[PDB]
Ligand binder design. Sequence first.
Ligand SMILES: COc1ccc(Cc2ncc(CN3CCC(c4ccccc4OC)CC3)c3cc(OC)c(OC)cc23)cc1OC
Lengths: 10, 258
Amino acid sequence: HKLVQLLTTT
Amino acid sequence: ESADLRALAKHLYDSYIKSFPLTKAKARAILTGKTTDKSPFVIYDMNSLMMGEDKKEVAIRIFQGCQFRSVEAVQEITEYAKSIPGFVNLDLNDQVTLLKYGVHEIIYTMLASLMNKDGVLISEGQGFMTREFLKSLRKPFGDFMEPKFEFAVKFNALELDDSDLAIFIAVIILSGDRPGLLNVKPIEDIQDNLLQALELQLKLNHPESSQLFAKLLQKMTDLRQIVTEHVQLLQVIKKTETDMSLHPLLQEIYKDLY
Ligand SMILES: COc1ccc(Cc2ncc(CN3CCC(c4ccccc4OC)CC3)c3cc(OC)c(OC)cc23)cc1OC
């Protein structure tokens, strides 16, 4: 969730 | 093919340099004096700590400091993971699961770079907190660091460098045996390649180091136990010390973890 945010930031 | 395995090794090293401001090379330089006048401030007791903090109870402020630094570490490690070839094409829930279950093993791997038998570099290399001071902290907080010293000392005796560490950490992240993984096979194919790359790196970089690859793989096992013990301590703190809590990013990681 915050992890998903970190994983998809470019 | 071995040229492809070397390209992979170098790409992982390049990505490690881009993801982690503090490398083992720089840490060891500080630890051994091979930089400049700016020798680290030593924290060995409570006066030291007050003096150092310049430039709740003590155990709890140290706990809260490590948790805050842990958040930044998760972020850097996530950035690194996204540079492992194939990783960002994995199902996103599987990416989350690999990070959730792997990030702590990587944290303790990299913390070892900052450690010797006598203490740990803190504040990005500007301070040095002694092993005996951390040990002096009241239970349960005094139990955090000591098994990591035990680990770091034996791990650092293998003399891995940043180039070796980059592949080591990728191998760990791409572990097909994490609970709740949806597609194990593409993870295992990536890991299989990483392992071949690691095997070749260790042979070329440490040609006379006896059974270094085997000893390394064994360390990946020992990290899981380090983490289990760490998480049990966090559980105790949650149950019995509840006057406080983790950062939301760490809460996510810890939710339903072991
Ligand atoms: C009393 O309470 C505790 C006592 C000990 C601990 C154990 C502990 N866990 C995590 C970090 C974060 N660190 C991981 C390595 C990371 C790192 C190092 C080098 C390179 C990359 C990198 O991260 C990406 C940088 C950030 C720590 C950093 C420390 O000094 C800086 C430290 O000094 C003793 C102890 C640390 C947790 C406690 O409570 C939770």
